[PDB]
Short mmCIF file of C-alpha atoms and ligand atoms in Angstrom, two decimals:
data_model
loop_
_atom_site.label_atom_id
_atom_site.label_comp_id
_atom_site.label_asym_id
_atom_site.label_seq_id
_atom_site.Cartn_x
_atom_site.Cartn_y
_atom_site.Cartn_z
CA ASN A 1 32.46 -3.11 -21.95
CA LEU A 2 30.93 -6.87 -21.03
CA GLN A 3 28.03 -6.93 -19.15
CA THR A 4 28.26 -7.57 -15.31
CA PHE A 5 25.82 -9.88 -13.37
CA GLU A 6 25.59 -10.55 -9.59
CA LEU A 7 24.21 -14.35 -8.64
CA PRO A 8 21.60 -14.65 -5.79
CA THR A 9 22.85 -16.90 -3.66
CA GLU A 10 20.09 -19.30 -4.42
CA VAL A 11 17.86 -19.81 -7.34
CA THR A 12 14.22 -20.33 -6.41
CA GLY A 13 12.33 -19.83 -9.59
CA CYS A 14 10.55 -16.67 -8.41
CA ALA A 15 9.72 -14.29 -11.32
CA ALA A 16 13.04 -11.90 -10.33
CA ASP A 17 15.51 -15.15 -10.99
CA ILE A 18 13.73 -15.74 -14.17
CA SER A 19 14.01 -11.88 -15.22
CA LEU A 20 17.81 -12.08 -14.64
CA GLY A 21 17.86 -15.72 -16.98
CA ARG A 22 16.26 -13.61 -19.54
CA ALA A 23 18.86 -11.45 -19.28
CA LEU A 24 21.89 -13.87 -19.30
CA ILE A 25 20.34 -15.48 -22.41
CA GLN A 26 20.24 -11.80 -24.26
CA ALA A 27 24.03 -11.22 -23.20
CA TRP A 28 25.04 -13.95 -24.75
CA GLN A 29 22.98 -13.56 -27.60
CA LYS A 30 24.50 -10.31 -27.97
CA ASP A 31 28.05 -10.63 -26.78
CA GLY A 32 28.77 -13.48 -26.74
CA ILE A 33 29.71 -13.73 -23.15
CA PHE A 34 29.24 -11.72 -19.90
CA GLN A 35 30.93 -11.50 -16.17
CA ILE A 36 29.77 -12.20 -12.93
CA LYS A 37 31.04 -10.87 -9.98
CA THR A 38 32.72 -12.46 -7.05
CA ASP A 39 32.88 -12.01 -3.84
CA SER A 40 35.81 -11.80 -1.40
CA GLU A 41 36.20 -15.19 -1.00
CA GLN A 42 35.74 -16.05 -4.64
CA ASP A 43 38.34 -13.80 -5.25
CA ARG A 44 40.41 -15.13 -2.87
CA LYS A 45 40.27 -18.45 -3.90
CA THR A 46 41.09 -17.92 -7.57
CA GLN A 47 44.08 -15.63 -6.74
CA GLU A 48 45.29 -18.30 -4.83
CA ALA A 49 44.82 -20.95 -7.56
CA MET A 50 46.53 -18.80 -9.98
CA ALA A 51 50.00 -18.82 -7.38
CA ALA A 52 50.00 -22.37 -6.44
CA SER A 53 49.89 -22.45 -10.69
CA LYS A 54 52.59 -20.42 -11.15
CA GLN A 55 55.07 -21.54 -8.25
CA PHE A 56 53.96 -25.49 -9.90
CA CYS A 57 55.02 -24.37 -14.08
CA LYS A 58 58.51 -23.36 -12.39
CA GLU A 59 59.24 -26.27 -11.32
CA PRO A 60 61.67 -28.46 -13.69
CA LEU A 61 59.95 -30.07 -16.53
CA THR A 62 60.83 -33.48 -15.20
CA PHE A 63 59.09 -33.09 -12.54
CA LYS A 64 55.87 -32.07 -13.96
CA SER A 65 55.62 -34.14 -16.51
CA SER A 66 55.80 -37.03 -13.54
CA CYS A 67 52.14 -35.52 -13.18
CA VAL A 68 50.33 -38.20 -14.86
CA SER A 69 47.76 -41.09 -14.65
CA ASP A 70 47.08 -44.14 -17.09
CA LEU A 71 43.62 -44.68 -15.50
CA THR A 72 42.66 -40.55 -15.71
CA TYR A 73 43.50 -37.40 -18.06
CA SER A 74 44.40 -35.52 -15.35
CA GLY A 75 47.41 -33.98 -15.08
CA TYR A 76 50.08 -31.97 -16.93
CA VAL A 77 50.18 -31.22 -20.36
CA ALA A 78 53.13 -29.89 -21.76
CA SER A 79 53.38 -26.86 -24.27
CA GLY A 80 53.03 -27.92 -28.18
CA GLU A 81 51.18 -30.69 -27.58
CA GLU A 82 47.62 -29.84 -28.39
CA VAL A 83 46.73 -28.83 -31.52
CA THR A 84 43.94 -26.29 -33.03
CA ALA A 85 43.36 -26.45 -36.78
CA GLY A 86 46.18 -27.89 -37.19
CA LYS A 87 48.55 -26.05 -35.18
CA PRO A 88 50.62 -26.61 -32.29
CA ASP A 89 49.16 -24.10 -29.41
CA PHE A 90 51.62 -22.84 -26.76
CA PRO A 91 50.28 -23.12 -23.52
CA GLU A 92 51.11 -26.01 -20.76
CA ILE A 93 48.34 -27.11 -18.82
CA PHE A 94 47.41 -28.68 -15.99
CA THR A 95 43.79 -30.49 -16.73
CA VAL A 96 41.67 -31.34 -13.17
CA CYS A 97 39.18 -34.15 -13.80
CA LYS A 98 37.17 -35.50 -10.88
CA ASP A 99 39.31 -36.41 -8.04
CA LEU A 100 38.25 -39.90 -7.77
CA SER A 101 40.50 -42.79 -5.47
CA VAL A 102 40.96 -46.35 -6.48
CA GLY A 103 38.26 -47.32 -3.98
CA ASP A 104 35.87 -45.47 -6.36
CA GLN A 105 33.35 -48.53 -7.45
CA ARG A 106 33.76 -46.53 -11.22
CA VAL A 107 37.99 -47.11 -10.82
CA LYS A 108 37.30 -50.03 -9.39
CA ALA A 109 35.60 -51.79 -12.57
CA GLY A 110 37.93 -49.78 -14.99
CA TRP A 111 35.47 -46.92 -16.26
CA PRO A 112 37.52 -45.01 -18.93
CA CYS A 113 38.78 -41.79 -17.63
CA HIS A 114 38.20 -42.34 -13.74
CA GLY A 115 40.98 -42.33 -11.36
CA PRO A 116 42.55 -40.19 -9.14
CA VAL A 117 44.61 -36.74 -10.28
CA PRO A 118 48.24 -36.95 -10.01
CA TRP A 119 48.20 -33.65 -8.00
CA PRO A 120 51.77 -32.15 -7.22
CA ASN A 121 51.47 -31.45 -3.87
CA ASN A 122 48.84 -31.08 -1.17
CA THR A 123 48.98 -27.24 -1.08
CA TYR A 124 48.25 -27.47 -5.38
CA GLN A 125 45.32 -29.44 -4.50
CA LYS A 126 43.93 -27.96 -2.23
CA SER A 127 44.40 -24.63 -3.48
CA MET A 128 42.27 -25.91 -6.57
CA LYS A 129 39.85 -28.18 -5.12
CA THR A 130 38.47 -25.13 -2.98
CA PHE A 131 38.29 -22.30 -6.15
CA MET A 132 36.13 -25.71 -8.51
CA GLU A 133 34.28 -25.96 -5.37
CA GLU A 134 33.09 -22.09 -5.89
CA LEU A 135 33.06 -22.76 -9.74
CA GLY A 136 30.62 -25.54 -9.54
CA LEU A 137 28.39 -23.36 -7.05
CA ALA A 138 28.14 -20.88 -9.30
CA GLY A 139 27.92 -23.16 -12.72
CA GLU A 140 24.42 -24.64 -10.84
CA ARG A 141 23.15 -21.41 -10.01
CA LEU A 142 23.96 -20.48 -13.93
CA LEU A 143 22.36 -23.45 -15.00
CA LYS A 144 19.23 -22.94 -12.98
CA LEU A 145 18.96 -19.39 -14.58
CA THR A 146 19.49 -20.47 -18.34
CA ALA A 147 16.34 -22.97 -17.91
CA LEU A 148 13.99 -20.27 -15.94
CA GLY A 149 15.26 -17.99 -19.27
CA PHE A 150 14.13 -20.08 -21.39
CA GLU A 151 10.35 -21.08 -19.44
CA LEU A 152 12.11 -24.61 -18.78
CA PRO A 153 11.48 -26.50 -15.87
CA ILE A 154 14.28 -25.07 -12.91
CA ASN A 155 15.84 -28.47 -13.07
CA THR A 156 16.04 -29.09 -16.96
CA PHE A 157 20.24 -28.86 -16.70
CA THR A 158 20.94 -29.43 -13.14
CA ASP A 159 19.02 -32.38 -13.23
CA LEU A 160 22.00 -33.72 -16.09
CA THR A 161 24.67 -32.16 -13.67
CA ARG A 162 24.40 -34.11 -10.77
CA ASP A 163 28.00 -35.77 -9.91
CA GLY A 164 28.60 -34.30 -12.96
CA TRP A 165 32.12 -34.41 -15.16
CA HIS A 166 33.06 -30.46 -14.08
CA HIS A 167 36.85 -29.90 -14.76
CA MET A 168 39.24 -28.09 -15.18
CA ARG A 169 42.27 -26.47 -17.29
CA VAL A 170 44.89 -24.37 -15.27
CA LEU A 171 46.90 -23.04 -17.93
CA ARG A 172 50.17 -20.56 -18.41
CA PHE A 173 50.86 -19.31 -21.88
CA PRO A 174 54.21 -18.65 -21.93
CA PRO A 175 55.59 -14.96 -23.09
CA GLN A 176 56.03 -13.99 -26.66
CA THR A 177 59.03 -14.83 -28.19
CA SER A 178 58.90 -14.57 -31.73
CA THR A 179 56.67 -12.76 -34.60
CA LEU A 180 54.43 -15.52 -33.52
CA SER A 181 51.77 -14.55 -30.99
CA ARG A 182 48.93 -17.09 -31.91
CA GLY A 183 48.67 -18.59 -28.29
CA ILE A 184 45.53 -20.78 -28.91
CA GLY A 185 44.11 -20.23 -32.19
CA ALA A 186 40.21 -20.20 -33.04
CA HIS A 187 37.93 -22.46 -31.36
CA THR A 188 34.67 -23.87 -29.97
CA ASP A 189 34.70 -25.71 -26.45
CA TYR A 190 33.37 -28.88 -26.35
CA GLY A 191 31.26 -29.18 -23.01
CA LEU A 192 28.22 -27.28 -21.31
CA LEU A 193 29.06 -24.04 -19.79
CA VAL A 194 32.29 -22.33 -19.31
CA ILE A 195 33.68 -19.82 -16.36
CA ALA A 196 36.83 -18.58 -17.34
CA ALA A 197 39.00 -16.47 -14.89
CA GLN A 198 42.67 -14.99 -15.47
CA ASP A 199 44.98 -13.31 -14.20
CA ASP A 200 45.77 -9.02 -14.75
CA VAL A 201 47.52 -9.93 -18.40
CA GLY A 202 45.05 -9.72 -21.11
CA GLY A 203 45.18 -12.23 -23.98
CA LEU A 204 41.13 -13.66 -23.82
CA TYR A 205 39.66 -12.84 -27.27
CA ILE A 206 36.30 -13.87 -27.95
CA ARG A 207 33.62 -13.98 -31.07
CA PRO A 208 30.11 -12.43 -30.55
CA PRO A 209 27.26 -13.64 -32.62
CA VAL A 210 26.62 -12.18 -35.76
CA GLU A 211 23.85 -12.07 -37.89
CA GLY A 212 23.90 -14.12 -40.91
CA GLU A 213 27.04 -15.77 -40.30
CA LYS A 214 26.74 -19.56 -40.46
CA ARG A 215 28.23 -21.69 -37.65
CA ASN A 216 28.84 -25.18 -37.90
CA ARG A 217 28.07 -27.83 -35.40
CA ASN A 218 31.67 -28.24 -33.51
CA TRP A 219 29.93 -31.80 -31.98
CA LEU A 220 29.69 -33.34 -35.46
CA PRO A 221 32.90 -34.75 -37.40
CA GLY A 222 32.06 -32.63 -40.51
CA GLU A 223 31.50 -29.28 -39.05
CA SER A 224 34.73 -28.53 -37.15
CA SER A 225 34.92 -24.73 -35.63
CA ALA A 226 38.50 -24.83 -35.74
CA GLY A 227 40.34 -21.71 -36.98
CA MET A 228 36.96 -20.22 -38.39
CA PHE A 229 36.96 -16.94 -38.09
CA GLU A 230 40.16 -16.38 -36.70
CA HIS A 231 41.73 -13.52 -38.62
CA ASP A 232 37.76 -11.31 -39.55
CA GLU A 233 36.16 -9.30 -37.05
CA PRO A 234 34.95 -9.30 -34.40
CA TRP A 235 36.96 -10.34 -31.94
CA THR A 236 36.47 -8.98 -28.55
CA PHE A 237 39.08 -8.50 -25.58
CA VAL A 238 37.98 -9.45 -22.59
CA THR A 239 39.66 -7.16 -20.41
CA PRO A 240 41.05 -8.47 -17.16
CA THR A 241 39.02 -6.88 -14.74
CA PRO A 242 39.62 -7.88 -10.61
CA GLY A 243 36.08 -8.95 -9.30
CA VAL A 244 34.70 -10.39 -11.85
CA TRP A 245 34.45 -14.20 -13.43
CA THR A 246 33.24 -14.38 -17.42
CA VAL A 247 30.93 -17.05 -18.46
CA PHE A 248 29.80 -18.64 -22.07
CA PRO A 249 28.29 -21.36 -23.26
CA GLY A 250 30.21 -24.54 -24.95
CA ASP A 251 29.20 -26.65 -28.02
CA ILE A 252 26.66 -28.96 -25.58
CA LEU A 253 24.48 -25.90 -24.71
CA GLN A 254 24.43 -24.77 -28.72
CA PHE A 255 23.58 -28.53 -29.08
CA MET A 256 20.37 -28.67 -26.83
CA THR A 257 19.28 -25.17 -27.40
CA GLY A 258 19.54 -25.72 -31.20
CA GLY A 259 21.27 -23.12 -31.90
CA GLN A 260 19.89 -20.71 -29.55
CA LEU A 261 22.77 -20.04 -27.84
CA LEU A 262 26.68 -20.47 -29.81
CA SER A 263 28.52 -21.81 -28.49
CA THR A 264 31.71 -19.10 -28.15
CA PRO A 265 34.56 -18.52 -30.39
CA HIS A 266 37.62 -17.81 -28.62
CA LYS A 267 41.17 -17.46 -29.08
CA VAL A 268 44.26 -16.08 -27.31
CA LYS A 269 47.18 -14.06 -28.39
CA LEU A 270 50.52 -14.45 -26.35
CA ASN A 271 51.21 -11.45 -24.24
CA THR A 272 54.72 -10.15 -23.99
CA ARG A 273 54.90 -11.63 -20.16
CA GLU A 274 53.27 -14.81 -19.28
CA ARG A 275 49.58 -15.06 -18.33
CA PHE A 276 48.04 -17.55 -16.06
CA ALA A 277 44.04 -18.25 -16.65
CA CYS A 278 41.54 -21.48 -15.56
CA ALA A 279 38.71 -22.55 -18.04
CA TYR A 280 36.09 -24.25 -15.76
CA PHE A 281 34.05 -26.67 -17.71
CA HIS A 282 30.68 -27.30 -15.98
CA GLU A 283 29.51 -30.80 -17.40
CA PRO A 284 26.92 -33.02 -17.61
CA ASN A 285 27.20 -36.65 -15.34
CA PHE A 286 29.70 -38.94 -17.22
CA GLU A 287 26.57 -41.35 -17.85
CA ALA A 288 24.10 -38.25 -18.63
CA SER A 289 22.39 -37.92 -22.41
CA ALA A 290 22.28 -34.44 -24.06
CA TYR A 291 19.29 -33.84 -25.83
CA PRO A 292 17.62 -31.14 -28.08
CA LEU A 293 15.43 -29.62 -25.55
CA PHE A 294 13.23 -27.67 -28.25
CA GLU A 295 13.22 -30.31 -31.38
CA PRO A 296 11.12 -33.28 -29.57
CA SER A 297 10.77 -35.26 -32.18
CA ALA A 298 14.69 -34.87 -33.17
CA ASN A 299 16.47 -38.58 -32.24
CA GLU A 300 20.04 -36.79 -32.08
CA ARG A 301 21.76 -37.24 -28.86
CA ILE A 302 25.04 -36.76 -27.22
CA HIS A 303 26.44 -39.59 -24.51
CA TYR A 304 28.38 -37.21 -22.46
CA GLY A 305 30.92 -40.27 -20.91
CA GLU A 306 31.28 -41.19 -24.94
CA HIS A 307 31.99 -37.62 -25.97
CA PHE A 308 34.75 -36.58 -23.37
CA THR A 309 36.40 -40.33 -23.81
CA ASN A 310 36.50 -39.42 -27.59
CA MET A 311 37.46 -36.21 -27.01
CA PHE A 312 40.28 -37.03 -24.88
CA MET A 313 41.61 -39.87 -27.15
CA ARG A 314 41.98 -37.79 -29.70
CA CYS A 315 43.47 -34.99 -28.40
CA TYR A 316 46.34 -37.19 -26.32
CA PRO A 317 46.98 -40.04 -28.61
CA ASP A 318 49.93 -41.05 -26.84
CA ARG A 319 49.10 -40.72 -23.51
CA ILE A 320 49.72 -43.52 -20.74
CA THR A 321 45.82 -43.09 -20.24
CA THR A 322 44.82 -43.73 -23.94
CA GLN A 323 47.38 -46.42 -24.12
CA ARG A 324 45.56 -48.08 -21.25
CA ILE A 325 42.38 -47.69 -22.52
CA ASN A 326 43.18 -49.44 -25.03
CA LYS A 327 44.83 -51.98 -23.82
CA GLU A 328 42.09 -52.85 -21.19
CA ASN A 329 39.50 -52.41 -23.70
CA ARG A 330 37.74 -49.96 -21.83
CA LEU A 331 35.44 -48.01 -24.16
CA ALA A 332 33.59 -51.36 -23.85
CA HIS A 333 32.44 -50.53 -20.69
CA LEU A 334 30.83 -47.19 -21.98
CA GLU A 335 28.58 -49.88 -24.17
CA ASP A 336 27.77 -51.69 -21.04
CA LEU A 337 26.52 -48.79 -19.06
CA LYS A 338 23.67 -47.86 -21.63
CA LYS A 339 22.49 -51.65 -22.08
CA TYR A 340 19.12 -51.63 -20.00
CA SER A 341 18.42 -47.68 -19.60
CA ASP A 342 15.31 -46.18 -21.36
CA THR A 343 16.53 -44.19 -24.68
C1 LIG B 1 50.61 -17.78 -37.04
C2 LIG B 1 50.90 -16.37 -36.51
O1 LIG B 1 50.55 -14.78 -37.22
C3 LIG B 1 51.25 -16.06 -35.10
O2 LIG B 1 51.40 -16.73 -34.48
O3 LIG B 1 51.20 -15.19 -34.62
O1 LIG B 2 40.88 -19.04 -20.99
C1 LIG B 2 42.28 -19.12 -21.56
O2 LIG B 2 42.84 -18.32 -21.94
C2 LIG B 2 41.67 -19.65 -22.74
C3 LIG B 2 41.81 -21.15 -22.46
C4 LIG B 2 40.80 -22.02 -24.09
O3 LIG B 2 40.34 -21.29 -24.53
C5 LIG B 2 40.64 -23.89 -23.40
O4 LIG B 2 41.15 -23.93 -22.41
O5 LIG B 2 39.88 -24.28 -24.15
MN1 LIG B 3 38.83 -22.74 -25.04
MN1 LIG B 4 41.77 -31.02 -26.67
#
């Protein structure tokens, strides 16, 4: 039912790249999502990542809970700690942020959220790193095609995503265990571009754009999208399909395009067996600021590092990472890093 596209290995800006970019935009504007074909290596790396996740989630909770850091938000989040629209969600999550050693200048300087991933083991680490490298190559192709489809300079988005704050939620949803099956409530993702992968079980639903339907700007405090539309059609079931990933826009793409793209609402229904999935977020650099592309006189911005840091401090207010940000006033580094820049 969803449209499927094959991305070229390199995007150069030829007229055929532009036509493809236009078709991607159209598919987002019609369906809110599309599929991209994966080759055998991309597929193999996806399956290996799922298998490492399955093996890790079988480890005792005492061990899983130890995969945490007071420097980065990377690591384990137990089920029931995350909340959407006020109702706790069901998946357990391992978040992979940029994996920076304590010798990296940003970690040495104590920038908020910067630090080494607390990996469960080296085998899990290698599976996730090599999967995320392929996801990143796809994200860059997608962002060049999107710029081209809007008749923007080819590097409009990728200039912001150099050394971008790419990160991935590695998710396991439990089987249904009662009448309740809302695994994650309706929400939109806070980032730029989302690439999603899943096993064969099934449970992700997305909402296409709806003519005449008002959508909130979820990056603004007084316009949360959480919970909206949850019990009203249309919700498109994202059918597990071999040999594809799916792609949809996040809040920052809605912001930059002034709503010409909408951040795709999505939710997860628990299945009668456990379900593994990965949600990859291809993001601006921690120091980059998103801006409105088509309203040049608009002064509003989204400073990405501030956006991410505030989000994660609110989501995990008791995590050791948040406590150390507060104890050491790490937010002050964000203020400092903008001091002498051209706004
Ligand atoms: C709430 C609800 O209906 C569910 O979790 O299935
Ligand atoms: O891909 C999925 O299963 C949903 C994950 C999701 O919506 C999220 O992590 O924000
Ligand atoms: Mn999401
Ligand atoms: Mn969150």
